[PDB]
Every structure is written in C-alpha cells, then in structure tokens.
Design a protein around this ligand. Sequence first.
Ligand code: 07D
Ligand SMILES: CCc1c(C)c2cc3nc(cc4[nH]c(c(CCC(=O)OC/C=C(\C)CC/C=C(\C)CC/C=C(\C)CCC=C(C)C)c4C)c4c5nc(cc1[nH]2)C(C)=C5C(=O)[C@@H]4C(=O)OC)C(C)=C3C(C)=O
Ligand SMILES: COC(C)(C)C\C=C/C(C)=C/C=C/C(C)=C/C=C/C(C)=C/C=C\C=C(C)\C=C\C=C(C)\C=C\C=C(C)\C=C\CC(C)(C)OC
Ligand SMILES: CCCCCCCCCCCCO[C@@H]1O[C@H](CO)[C@@H](O[C@H]2O[C@H](CO)[C@@H](O)[C@H](O)[C@H]2O)[C@H](O)[C@H]1O
Ligand SMILES: CCCCCCCCCCCCO[C@@H]1O[C@H](CO)[C@@H](O[C@H]2O[C@H](CO)[C@@H](O)[C@H](O)[C@H]2O)[C@H](O)[C@H]1O
Ligand SMILES: CCCCCCCCCCCCO[C@@H]1O[C@H](CO)[C@@H](O[C@H]2O[C@H](CO)[C@@H](O)[C@H](O)[C@H]2O)[C@H](O)[C@H]1O
Ligand SMILES: CCCCCCCCCCCCO[C@@H]1O[C@H](CO)[C@@H](O[C@H]2O[C@H](CO)[C@@H](O)[C@H](O)[C@H]2O)[C@H](O)[C@H]1O
Ligand SMILES: [Fe+3]
Lengths: 304, 275, 256, 45, 45, 44, 44, 45, 47, 47, 47, 47, 47, 47, 47
Amino acid sequence: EYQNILTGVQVRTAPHSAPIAKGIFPRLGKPGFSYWLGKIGDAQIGPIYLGTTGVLSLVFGFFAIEIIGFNLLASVNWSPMEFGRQFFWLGLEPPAAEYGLGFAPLAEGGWWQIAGFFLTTSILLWWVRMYRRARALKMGTHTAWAFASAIFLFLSLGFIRPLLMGNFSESVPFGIFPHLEWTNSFSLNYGNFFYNPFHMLSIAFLYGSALLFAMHGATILAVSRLGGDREVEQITDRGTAAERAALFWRWTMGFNATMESIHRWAWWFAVLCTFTGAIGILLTGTVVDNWFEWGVKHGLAPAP
Amino acid sequence: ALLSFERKYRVRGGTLIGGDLFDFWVGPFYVGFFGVTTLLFTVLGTALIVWGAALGPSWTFWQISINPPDVSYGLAMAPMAKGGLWQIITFSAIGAFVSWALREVEICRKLGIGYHIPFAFGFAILAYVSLVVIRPVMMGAWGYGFPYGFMTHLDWVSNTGYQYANFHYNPAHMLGITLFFTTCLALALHGSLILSAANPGKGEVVKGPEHENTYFQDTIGYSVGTLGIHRVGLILALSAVVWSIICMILSGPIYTGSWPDWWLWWQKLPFWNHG
Amino acid sequence: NKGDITGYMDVAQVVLYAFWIFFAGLIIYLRREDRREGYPLEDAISGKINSLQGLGSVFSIARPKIFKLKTGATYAAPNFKRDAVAIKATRTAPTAGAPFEPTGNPMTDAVGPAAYALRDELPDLTLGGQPAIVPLRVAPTFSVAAEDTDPRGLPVVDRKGAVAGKVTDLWIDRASIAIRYLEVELAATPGRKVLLPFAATRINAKTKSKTVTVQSILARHFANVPTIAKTDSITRREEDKVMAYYSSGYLYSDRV
Amino acid sequence: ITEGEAKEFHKIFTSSILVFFGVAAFAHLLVWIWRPWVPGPNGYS
Amino acid sequence: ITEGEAKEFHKIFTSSILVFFGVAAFAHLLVWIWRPWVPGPNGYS
Amino acid sequence: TEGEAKEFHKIFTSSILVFFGVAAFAHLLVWIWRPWVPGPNGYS
Amino acid sequence: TEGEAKEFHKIFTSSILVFFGVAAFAHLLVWIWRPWVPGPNGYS
Amino acid sequence: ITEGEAKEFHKIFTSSILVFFGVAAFAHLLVWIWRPWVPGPNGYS
Amino acid sequence: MWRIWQLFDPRQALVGLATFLFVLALLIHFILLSTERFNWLEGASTK
Amino acid sequence: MWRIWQLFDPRQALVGLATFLFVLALLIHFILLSTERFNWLEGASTK
Amino acid sequence: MWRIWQLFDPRQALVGLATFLFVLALLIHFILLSTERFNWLEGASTK
Amino acid sequence: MWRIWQLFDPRQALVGLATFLFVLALLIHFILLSTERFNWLEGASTK
Amino acid sequence: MWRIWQLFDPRQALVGLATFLFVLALLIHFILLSTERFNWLEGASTK
Amino acid sequence: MWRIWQLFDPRQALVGLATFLFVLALLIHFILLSTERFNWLEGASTK
Amino acid sequence: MWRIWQLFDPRQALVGLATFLFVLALLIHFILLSTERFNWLEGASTK
Ligand code: 07D
Ligand SMILES: CCc1c(C)c2cc3nc(cc4[nH]c(c(CCC(=O)OC/C=C(\C)CC/C=C(\C)CC/C=C(\C)CCC=C(C)C)c4C)c4c5nc(cc1[nH]2)C(C)=C5C(=O)[C@@H]4C(=O)OC)C(C)=C3C(C)=O
Ligand SMILES: COC(C)(C)C\C=C/C(C)=C/C=C/C(C)=C/C=C/C(C)=C/C=C\C=C(C)\C=C\C=C(C)\C=C\C=C(C)\C=C\CC(C)(C)OC
Ligand SMILES: CCCCCCCCCCCCO[C@@H]1O[C@H](CO)[C@@H](O[C@H]2O[C@H](CO)[C@@H](O)[C@H](O)[C@H]2O)[C@H](O)[C@H]1O
Ligand SMILES: CCCCCCCCCCCCO[C@@H]1O[C@H](CO)[C@@H](O[C@H]2O[C@H](CO)[C@@H](O)[C@H](O)[C@H]2O)[C@H](O)[C@H]1O
Ligand SMILES: CCCCCCCCCCCCO[C@@H]1O[C@H](CO)[C@@H](O[C@H]2O[C@H](CO)[C@@H](O)[C@H](O)[C@H]2O)[C@H](O)[C@H]1O
Ligand SMILES: CCCCCCCCCCCCO[C@@H]1O[C@H](CO)[C@@H](O[C@H]2O[C@H](CO)[C@@H](O)[C@H](O)[C@H]2O)[C@H](O)[C@H]1O
Ligand SMILES: [Fe+3]
C-alpha cells in the first residue's frame, strides 16, 4: 500500500533549467542536491536568479532588517544574553500620534519609519521581480498578482491605514510578540474584531484555502498512480486521472472543477483571504469606530 | 445529466456496506448506504437546529444559537429544552461527518483511486470532535463545547481565548497559525504557478514541468516539484489542524492559566537568568 | 453618524454588498471555467444533450479557449468530443441512475476503474522536443541516486507473494526527475514484457531481502497488461491505458 | 468455511458466553447486595 | 500458521495467563488488606 | 533464527534477573528511607 | 564481524567501569558536601 | 585508512588532550583561588 | 411476508438492525439518565 | 441458533464483540464513577 | 481452543494485548492517583 | 519460554524495550518530584 | 553480554550512547541548578 | 583505545568535538555571567 | 602538529575560522558594551 507521501527511490541527473536571455546578470548558485527535499519533493537546489530588481530588493530588505535588528539589540543595551532573553518581547515601535505622517525622531519612531519604508520598497521590488521572472520565462503573471493581494494587506496594515488616519501611531511594530500584541490591541480598541464582516470573510477564505489545498492535495495524491500529479499535461490533454478526479467530487459533491479551474479556485480563495482583510483593516477606525456596535445595528448581535 | 466521460466509470461495486441496495446515483450524486445515513443525520440535525431557532428569540440567522448545557450539568445528558438539543445535534453532526467520509471511501473504491481524500477529511472530523467531545470530556462538562450559532460560536472563541488572557501566547497556537498562513501562501503559489504555466500569454505555447521548476528555482532558489507540492500542501493543512487540536487540548484539559506568563520559563533559563 | 450613508445604510455595509456582488460574479466565472471538460451534459441512458438547466445555460458554457503547444499542436477547451454511449457494460436497472454490470473481463475491456481517457498517441515532450518518459537505457546521463535501493533485478511479486516477474529496466520522466515505470519481464513468458507504474510499488527495502511488491493485481493479471509499441518511448494513451489497468486491480482483483 | 469447524466453534462460543454471563450475573448480584440500583419511592434511604 | 505450532503457543499463553493473574490477584489482595475499595452503608471510616 | 536465539533468550533472562535485583534493592532502600504506603492515619 | 567484538567488549567494559568509578567518586564528593536524602524532619 | 597514520594521529591527539586538560585545570585553580564555587553549610560568606 | 430475505442480505440486515437497536437503546437510556425521575443511578425521590 | 456462524465470519464477529464489550464496559464504569452513590473510589455514604 | 492461534496473528495478538493492557493499567493507576483515598503519594488520612 | 524471539526482531525489541524503560523511569521520577514527600531535591518534612 | 555487539554496530551505538549520556547529564545539571539547595553557583544557606 | 579512528574519521570527529566544546564553553561562561557571584564583568561583591 | 592540513582543506577552513573569530569578537564586544563598567562609549565613573 503506497501513497506517494514520500519518495522511496530518487533520481539525480545533470542540473538544467529553462533558457532565459543572459541579461546584465547571470544565474547564480552552483546547483546542488539535497536528500530530504528530494524525499518530499525535488532534490535540486538553485540556481537563484539575481537581476537588477533582485539586487535592489535585496539591498533595501537587508537595510531594513539591519536597522530593525540594530534597534532591537540597542533596546537591551547591546547585551547578547539579554537579547536572547527578550528577543520575542523586543520590538521596533512606530512613532507616536503627535508626529503625524512626518518624520519622527530616530529614537521616537524615525527608525521604525525608515525600516518600514525600506521594507515596503524591498517588497514592491520583489513583486516586480516575480513579474519580470514570470515574463522572462514566457509564462503568465498570476503569481505576481496573487502576491499583490498580500502586499495590499501588508500596506493597508502598515501604510495605507496610517495615511487615512493621518497617523503612524496605530501601525504594527517590528517584533515577534509586539506585533501579536498590536493585533490584540487593535481588535480590542475597535470592538471585537470578530464583528468585522470583512474579517469574517477573510477567515472564511483562509479556512477555505486550507480546505481547498487539502482537498486538492489529497485528490492529486489519490490520482497520482494515474499520472494525476502531472497537472498541466492533464490540462492540455485530459487523461483518466483528471476524469476520475472530477467524477469523485461530482459524485460526492454534485459538482466538480477542471484540472485547470481548480487552481483558479485555489488562486482566488488565497487572494480574497487578504483582499477582504485589507478592506476590513481600511474600514476600521476610519468608517467604523466600533465593530460590535456595527454588528448590533446590523443584526449580528442580540442588541444588549 | 452525465459528463462526456461519466458513463464509463458508473460501474457497481466499491461499497463497504449495503451490497447493491443503495449502489446507485441520484442526479450527479452517488448515494450508497452512507449517503442514506448522512441524509438521515443531516435532516435530523438541521431540523433540530431549526427547532432550537424556533425556541430562540430571533430567527435572525446570525443570532440563531444552540447552546450546550450549562457546566452545572457536568457530562450528564441534559433536558432537551436546556442543553440536550445541542448534544443531540452534536451526535447527529458526528454521525453525518462519519457517513460523509465513509461514502467518500466507497466512491474512492468505485473509481479505483487512493483514499487520501477521506483520510484528510478525517482530520477535520477529528478537530470538530476535539472541540465538542474530547475537550469537554477532559474538562468535565458539556458546557465547554461551542454553541451552534453563527456569531455565538465566535463569542465562544473569543471568551475561551481571553480565558487564558491572551491566547496568542499558546505556542501550539502559534505553530498552527504559522501552518495555516503557510498553507494559504503555498496554495496561492501553486494555483498561480499552474495558471501561469497553462496560460502564458498571447502566443506563448503551454509550458512544461521544466518551466514550472525553473520559475521557482529562479525566484526562490528551490522548486518542490509538480508532485511534491500537493504532498507538502496536504501535509501543511493537516498539520495546521493537528496543531490547532493540540493547542485546544493544551488549553483547559492540561493548562489552566495565563498563556502569556507561561513564557517566563524562557526568561529564566540558567544562561540568562540574571538572578 | 460618522460612517453612515443613508440613515441605516453605512459605508461598511455598502462595501460588503459590493463584495457580495463581486463574489457572485466570481462564482459564475469559476463555474464557467469548471464547465470546460465533460460539458455539455448528456442523458444517462440515451445520451442526448439534456440537463435540468435554467437561464444560466447561456452563461454556463464558455467559448473554447485555445491552448498552444510547443509542437504546433492546439487544444480547445471545451472541445465537445464525447464518449460513445454504448460501453462494454449493461445497466443493472433501466432507471438512468443504476450502475453497470461489465459484460466481460473488465481489466482488458477498460470498464470502470480500468477505463482510460481516449488521449492522443504522442509522448510527453521535454524542453528539447523529445519524449519525456524514456527507459534508462536510452538516457545515459540519468542515473538512480545513491542512498536508495536500486529497483533493478528485484523480484516483482503481488500481495499473495507469488513472484509475478523480474524487473529489468526503469522508465523515468525527463521533465520531472523521478521514476515513472518499472520494466518487468514475465517469469511465465520471456517473450512478453510489461510496464508497472512506480507509484504502484512498495520499496520493501526493510525485510529479509529486497523485492518489489504490488498490492493491486495478482501474478496472472500480468499476462494481460496492455502493451506498448516503441519499447523506448511511450505515448500518453498507452501510459494512461497501462495505469488504468493497474489501478483497476483493487476493485475486482478476484474475478467479478 | 468448514461446516464442522463452525459446529465445533459453537460449543466453545456457548461455553464462553455461559461463563461470561455467569461472571457478570455474580458481579451484578454482589453489587445489588452491596447497593441496589433500583430506587425506592422515597428515593435512596 | 502451522497446525500443531499453536498448541504449544496455547501452553505458553495459558502459563502467562496464570502468571499474570496470580500476581494481579496477589496485588489486589494486598490493596484490600491495606485499604478496601467497597464503602459500607454509612461510607468509609 | 531458530537455535541461535536460545543464547539470546538465556542472557536476556540473565539481564532480567540482574536488573530486577538492582531495582528491588533500590526499592528496599527507598522503603527504608520513606515508605510509599500510607497508614490508617496517613503519614503521621 | 566476530573477532573485533571480543576486544571491543573487553575495552568497553573497562571504559564503562572507569566512567562509573569517576561518577561514583563525584557522587561521593557531592554527598560529603550535601547529602540528597533528607531526614524525618527534612533537610538540616 | 591505514593504521600507521591512525597511531600517529592518536599520539598527538592524546598530547593535545593532555595540554588542553592541563591549561583547563590551571584556569580552574586560578578561578577557585579567585572565588570558590562550593558553598559551605552557611552558604557563601 | 414469506421470503423477504430473498431480497435483503441477511448479514447486512442483521448488522444494520443490531447497530440501529443498540444506538436507539443507548439514546433512550441516556435520555432517562438526563431526567430527574427515571435516573435510576441518582435515585431521586418520587415524592 | 447454531446456524448464525454458518455465514457470519468468525474472526471479525469476535473482534467486534470484544471491542464492543470493552467500550460498553468502560462507558458503564465511568457512568457509575460519575454517580454520587456507586462511585466506589470515594464512598459518599447512602444515609 | 488451539485453533484460535492459527486463526489470529500471534505477533499482532501479543503486541496489541501488551499495549492495551499497559494503557489500561496506566489509566487505572492515574485514576487511583486522582482519588483522594487511594493516592499512595499524598497519603491523606483515611478518617 | 524458549521460542518467543522467532516472531520479534531482537534488535528492535531491545530498542523499544530500552526506550519504554527509560520513558517510564523518567515518568515515575518526575511524578515523585511533583510529590511533596518523595521529592528528594526540594525536600520536605516527613512530619 | 558481549554478544550484544552483533545486533548494533558500534558506530551508531557509541554516538547514540554519547548523545544520550550528555543530554541526561545536562538535564540533571539544569535540575540541580534550578531547585534550591544543590545550586552550587547561588550557594544559599542550608538552614 | 586508539581503535576509535577506524569508525570515526578525524575530520568529522574533530569538527564535532570542536563545535561541542565551543558550545559548552559558551554555555558555561553565560551561566556564570547570569550568576552574581561569578559575573567577572559586573563584579558584584562577595558579601 | 603540522599534519592537520592533509585532512582540513585550507580554503574552507580559513573561511570558517575567520567567520567564527569575527562572531566571537563581536559577541565579546557586545557583552562588554552591555556592562556598566566596560562600556567605553557611554562612560561611567569607576569609583
Ligand atoms: C485578538 C486578535 C483578534 C481576534 C478577534 C482574531 C481572531 C482570528 N483571526 Mg484575525 N483576529 C484578531 C485581529 C486581527 N486579525 C487580523 C487578520 C487576520 C487574517 C490574516 C490573513 C493573513 O494571511 O495574514 C497574514 C498576511 C499578511 C500580513 C500580508 C502579507 C505579508 C507579507 C507579504 C509580508 C512579507 C514579509 C517579508 C518579506 C519578510 C521580512 C519582513 C520583516 C522581517 C518585518 C486572517 C483571516 C485572520 C484569522 C483569524 C482567525 C482564524 C481567528 C480566530 C480563530 O479567532 N485574522 C488581519 C486581517 O486581514 O483583518 C481583517 C488583520 O490585520 C487582523 C487583526 C487586527
Ligand atoms: C494570498 C496571500 C498569501 C498570504 C497568506 C501570505 C502571507 C505571508 N507571506 C509572507 C512572506 C512572504 N511572502 C512572499 C515573500 C516575499 C519576499 C520579499 O518580499 O522579499 C523582499 C524582502 C526582503 C529582501 C527582506 C528580507 C531579507 C532577508 C531575510 C535576507 C537578508 C540577507 C541578504 C539579502 C544577504 C544574503 C543572501 C544573498 C543571496 C547574498 C515572503 C516569503 C511572497 C508571496 N506571498 C504570497 C501570498 C501570500 N502571502 C505570494 C503569492 C507570494 C510571492 O510571490 C512572494 C514569494 O516570493 O513567494 C515565494 C509572510 C511573512 C506572511 C505572513 C503570514 O505574515
Ligand atoms: C541579518 O540579520 C542579522 C544581524 C542576524 C540579525 C538582524 C536582524 C534581526 C534579528 C531582525 C529581526 C526582526 C524581527 C523580529 C522582525 C519582526 C517583524 C514582524 C513580525 C513584522 C510584522 C509586521 C510589520 C508590518 C506589517 C509593518 C509594516 C509597515 C509599513 C508597511 C510601513 C511603511 C511606512 C512608510 C512607507 C513610511 C512612510 C513615512 C515616511 C515619510 C518616513 O516615508 C519616507
Ligand atoms: C524612490 C523611493 C524608493 C523606491 C525605489 C525606487 C527605485 C527602485 C524601483 C525603480 C523601478 C524598477 O523598475 C524596473 O527596473 C529595472 C532596472 O532597475 C528593470 O529591469 C532590469 O533588470 C532586470 C532584472 O530582472 C533585468 O531583466 C534587466 O537588466 C532589466 O530589465 C525593469 O525594466 C523595471 O521595470
Ligand atoms: C471508547 C470509550 C468511550 C467512553 C469514554 C468515556 C470517558 C468519560 C466518561 C464520563 C461519563 C460521565 O457520565 C456522566 O457524568 C456526569 C458528571 O456530572 C454525571 O452527572 C451527574 O452526577 C454529577 C455528580 O458526579 C452531578 O454533578 C450532575 O449534576 C449529575 O447530572 C452523569 O450522571 C453521567 O451520565
Ligand atoms: C445482567 C442482568 C441485570 C439484571 C438487573 C435487574 C434489575 C432489576 C431488579 C428489580 C428489583 C426490584 O426490587 C424491588 O425494588 C423496590 C423499588 O421499586 C425496592 O424497594 C425497597 O428498597 C428501596 C431502596 O431504595 C427502599 O427505598 C424502599 O422503601 C423499599 O421498598 C426493593 O428492593 C424491591 O421491592
Ligand atoms: C483481580 C480482580 C480483583 C477483583 C476484586 C473483587 C472485589 C470484590 C470485593 C467486594 C466483596 C464483598 O465484600 C463485602 O462488601 C461489604 C459491603 O458493605 C462489606 O461490608 C462490611 O464492610 C463495610 C465497609 O468496611 C463496613 O461498613 C462493615 O464492616 C460491613 O458492612 C465487606 O467488605 C464485605 O462483606
Ligand atoms: Fe495542483
């Protein structure tokens, strides 16, 4: 009874990759092989492409990470021991309300603003990198727009809502426990963030993404004895694996997808999980002061 | 009422129970014995939910709630008016979920495919059972299950989360959140890669597995593979559910205190316990 | 007050209803994409184009999108190329919902779990315009990685333990580096050679000796495995046929 | 599937059922003597 | 497996059953001598 | 794996007895220090 | 192998004996410093 | 893996262990002279 | 009802009835245990 | 009723018999333990 | 009474019985520990 | 007691037995540490 | 007990034994450091 | 005692020994730094 | 004590040694910075 959960016998060949124009930068990384990764998936590692947008994104991101880490280490007076003790509790806090959207003093949130700007720039440059890498390989840019949804949520959390409130004071800090505490206090300040309906939609789409990527993973693993793992080939030439995958769900559920359209569902659930989340974040504080009172007004709560 | 390829696999057999009695289809659905049983449990549970809505004061779909019995009843069966209806709906839901999974098993046997899908659904059934049976039994009362209501089960989630004064600090909860977020990210990447390979633009012949591997080799530095991605995705979702179950068993049955100050153990390891 | 639009209606509710409209449209779009294979629906008995469908039919089926291949080929989705109503089976009851009794040996008649899609007779292509599924003999560069049992020469047995045959060669996918097939020479017929999918094997590297076992079909069933033509490059239809035959074992591996 | 095997197994199944039911009945009698589980009209004295 | 290689397995199994049950009853007897687990009509002392 | 296991069983039982002997000696010492069976009054 | 096992065990027993003797010395020193078995009134 | 280089490795390995343990013991003697790490009955004074 | 077992599998029917009867009896027993009057373990007073 | 096992498979019937008996025994024992009267580990006394 | 062992798997029977009996013993011991009267570690007075 | 090992691999039998003995020894030791009376490290008084 | 070295190669046996021994010793040292009395660094008064 | 070197090649053995000893030295130094008595940098008084 | 380089290739050995030495030096400098006595940047009276 085999399951295609682990690859008992592996194959290793001469590393090769799809052809790209040389460009200013070559492929970098001297590809190698790994055993556990080949047990769970492919064994080859790299090479990683590092173009102009890749260099720009890496430099901006590294600057942001170094600024954040330097501030975290400085907050505990440069003690490696006490840095270890408080690492989770350490955080680069955003500037206070009084400074508006302008530059705060470095100790009072200027470093947070500089780090956030550099991180935003690196994330956007990484988005451009995904777009350009997809276009270079003569492929579509679905990954870029799926990423753009996540960037929308990130910018709504960090920049857009501060713009609307005219204030970075309620932005999320750069810390492990501090950003969870920001989540908790954001929910408390605005009345039981469960009563945010776009939060409910985002949770529905997150649950649906997990559900869908368990359903689809189990379906492809169930038809992997029939060439079902080779999804694009079953999309261009429908084999019996795709037919049985469709008929299983048609018989158990009443309807079914295509090998191509199931990944459209997969794309859209993931994208909507963050799109509705960004909308719900942009709506709180600006339009809806208290989500519990909005729910009471609109029939979500028994009106105490 | 059949797909272009459906009237070729509609053979009999593959049923665990019932023989040829319920081995048939109604419309698109396959029924089997376990389809009959899931109808039995679903109709009864939904009728009981609507009956509890009638006994309730709202009919507002989001304010309809079936509450479990008060904790003063312990693990005892409760009167139907006050607590018992929630218990019967719980048992009916468990029976319907099990019938659903078993019907999926019969469909898998009939189509000659693996039983991965019912096995994966077993984890969702286990999460529900841990929320309404296992955890309330360990805690000693049926009133620790969640109410069957649209917004009231969210009130239960919030109340139980703040019972430990910050439920984020539950480390198993952190790990389950990490797995859920990573599952969503991996699903986005996988659907995006498949769509981009199948729909590459004007001209732009359909790309092969080598192009899909090359994309993530260039962008990330590693590519899992068109078979291994479904593996890692199923494992990601199932592990997220497993660690959520673990974090809810840990809260109440095992740990009955503030999760935030559970982490003081970390603060006081001997190589930085400055005191 | 601050966020309202008209008395009871406010901005958040309006954005919510806008999302609901967008999600209804998105569900329609996704269902249109779903209805790109096996559509339109046929009658369960006669096979005429019929189904209980409403005013959404005009929007149910999408125009055929065109897939371009790196050979000049083209796929149309949906292509309304359907299967024949008359299959090698008979209705248990004439009620349009009843299952089918096979009218022969369903292993070799491609009925039920043995049924295979009627694909095209072309091997999968690599980035270089060559077959992807090839035996290791005609791929000198490819080799089996170490730290794994080499499945060459190991006895091929069923669940009953009878030695069905012996493995001589491995067939692998060039596009994705993994073993696809094991070439098995029959202990009963040296002049016969068969392909057994790698997904249907247990490694069995942890026992008294090393062997390859199959849990689906019995030893005698290896005498009727579908054959292939080129013996060094296999078409999609041939591989789909072989995989369907092997997958049909679990349902009726002991007669019908 | 041998019929004689089933006929032989019937004897051992009957002996097992008799000994198990006897143990259970003795246990229930001991429990009843210790504490009856059928309440009186006034509850439990 | 074998026809007669289970009678000796039955021998060792019944020997193990006696060895386990004897020490189990031995332990139970000491527990009862120490503290009985059946309360009297007015409870425990 | 039919006769060569006789020595394995014999020295297995030898290890059984010696480990149980040291464990019983440990338990005897612990009992002398502090018994683990309460009396009618408990632990006095 | 079989020949290597003789001397391998011959020096394994000596090495474990040396480790156990050092551990016994360490425990005896610690007991001299502070015994870890309390008294009827606890730790004096 | 010829054993001559094994022996040549082992001799200098033993010498290295000896010098490492010697310098470590000298360091421990210096630290003990500085501050002892075994408290007496009354603790640290 | 002469031969109704020429239509229903006796094994499947017997197993289904055993399971149904056990489940129904367990449900009725638990319902009685939920009450104040027929809980023979709590043993409340009729008067 | 010596013809029940003529078609009933013996091994599955006995495995399920033992499992069902054990589960029911656990349930009844725990129910008794939950009672204020038959809990033999505390003995809350009748009168 | 000997054909039972040629009916069942001798290795599976031993493994399952050993683990099941161990789990049962562990549960009984932990229940006794949770009991005020029979906890042999806290040692509260019988009176 | 002569022919047990023909069914169980002695290597894995020893590995599993040693793992079980170590785990159970740790469980008993930590349980005693959690007790007041048998904690030999954070020691308490018998009386 | 010399024959034990045919079941287990000394290669894996010694690395496993060494890592287990070091982990056990380190955990015991942590336990002693943490309790109250055998912590040789804080060195509190015994009485 | 030299026989170690035909199972453990000196490359891996010495790199592992170096990593282990360096980690242990860091551990002991940090543990000392956490104690007041032996923190040679803060230099709290003995009394 | 020169025969080391037959095993350890100078290329990766030097890179690892340099990285380790830099990390150790940085760690010590940070530890010194934290301490109120040896912080040469903030500056504090010894007396
Ligand atoms: C007490 C807390 C309170 C409580 C009531 C509660 C409970 C629950 N909630 Mg919630 N939540 C509360 C508050 C609250 N909640 C959210 C969000 C969500 C979404 C996130 C989706 C996601 O993927 O995020 C995650 C995606 C992001 C943040 C966007 C993409 C991120 C990117 C590209 C970052 C790129 C990073 C690098 C390149 C690395 C280098 C950078 C550095 C080192 C710095 C999701 C659906 C979700 C789930 C649930 C569940 C299941 C529950 C249960 C069971 O109770 N919650 C966010 C949101 O969208 O809200 C509308 C948000 O902002 C916010 C707030 C304030
Ligand atoms: C559908 C909604 C879905 C949700 C649930 C979801 C959530 C979260 N997604 C998260 C993180 C990331 N997401 C990503 C990438 C961006 C990388 C970046 O910005 O680099 C740009 C930054 C930086 C350069 C800064 C640091 C750099 C470091 C640490 C290295 C520093 C050292 C250097 C340079 C020197 C050494 C090395 C040399 C070579 C010299 C990261 C890993 C991406 C995508 N999400 C998508 C979608 C989703 N993301 C899609 C479709 C994606 C992409 O296409 C893209 C990608 O590359 O995916 C592989 C997080 C933390 C999430 C949570 C839960 O909070
Ligand atoms: C490589 O690193 C070595 C040295 C080892 C270590 C270095 C660093 C370390 C250890 C870093 C650790 C970092 C940690 C723990 C980070 C935790 C980060 C988390 C959890 C962040 C989570 C959320 C934060 C978000 C979403 C913040 C978003 C902020 C945004 C988008 C702000 C944008 C602000 C802008 C654009 C400001 C505009 C205003 C002005 C005018 C200033 O712009 C010019
Ligand atoms: C100003 C505030 C801070 C924000 C940062 C602004 C500068 C960084 C973003 C500038 C815009 C980048 O936009 C992008 O630039 C790079 C060159 O840099 C170009 O891309 C170039 O590098 C890519 C890397 O894959 C190569 O294929 C090739 O050398 C060339 O195409 C893209 O054609 C352009 O789309
Ligand atoms: C595979 C095995 C599956 C079964 C495993 C079961 C494990 C746990 C079983 C617990 C059974 C509890 O059973 C139920 O307990 C509650 C506890 O309040 C009892 O409740 C009753 O007694 C308690 C006192 O003990 C009272 O406070 C309560 O008001 C009263 O209703 C019920 O009379 C009993 O029916
Ligand atoms: C495995 C087989 C299991 C078989 C189990 C059989 C259970 C049924 C036993 C029925 C015995 C009835 O016995 C009858 O019950 C009544 C209650 O109505 C009891 O009534 C008597 O005892 C109760 C004790 O609470 C007193 O309060 C009451 O005043 C007194 O009359 C008596 O004991 C007896 O007259
Ligand atoms: C290996 C499996 C172990 C099997 C264990 C079997 C346990 C069975 C033990 C119970 C047997 C009956 O034992 C009987 O119970 C009654 C119940 O009032 C008790 O009756 C006596 O003791 C109680 C309680 O101390 C006192 O109030 C009084 O002295 C007297 O009534 C006695 O203990 C005994 O006469
Ligand atoms: Fe997929």
